[PDB]
Write a protein that binds this DNA or RNA. Sequence first.
DNA 1: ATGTGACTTATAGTCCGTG
DNA 2: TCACGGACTATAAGTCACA
Lengths: 77, 76
Amino acid sequence: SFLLSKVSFVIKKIRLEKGMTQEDLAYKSNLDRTYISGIERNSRNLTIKSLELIMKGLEVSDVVFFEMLIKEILKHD
Amino acid sequence: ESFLLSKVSFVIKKIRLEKGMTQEDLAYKSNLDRTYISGIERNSRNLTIKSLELIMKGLEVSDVVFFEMLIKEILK
DNA sequence: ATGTGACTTATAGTCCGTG
DNA sequence: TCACGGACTATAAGTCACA
């Protein structure tokens, strides 16, 4: 899956920009630390609701997240 | 009771009706069961990103177009 | 046509760990 | 702190019999 690797790239990018650990993100997302790791390393198939939890844990608006996703989708060569 | 979910379901339906397609046509094109797509449009199915990809492919819409439409629906 | 409850099967997502 | 794995539970995927 093409889209999952882009979602998971954007998640890890924002997390690092915010200086958050995977545990910080797990805690603010109401998700397990190993699930955050799984998402980032293995581009796990998130639900819409868990994606929403994560964007909330990253403290980014949905719009900003989806604009970054679009950027990552349009990246080429 | 999810803000994002209600926006995603509204966009899938909006594009489906824009393409003049029935849920059954969408089922055919996405290889998903029509009663499964009904549940999504009715906001009663927390779909994964994989399922959303099959739906977007079924709608013959690019990810970028779908996301731009989702952004606009979020801003309304 | 679409909608829905009530399922079975597959997997999202949690919990217990390690080096 | 995080990659990685076993084993588990909660819930999504997928289906159908109605409505």
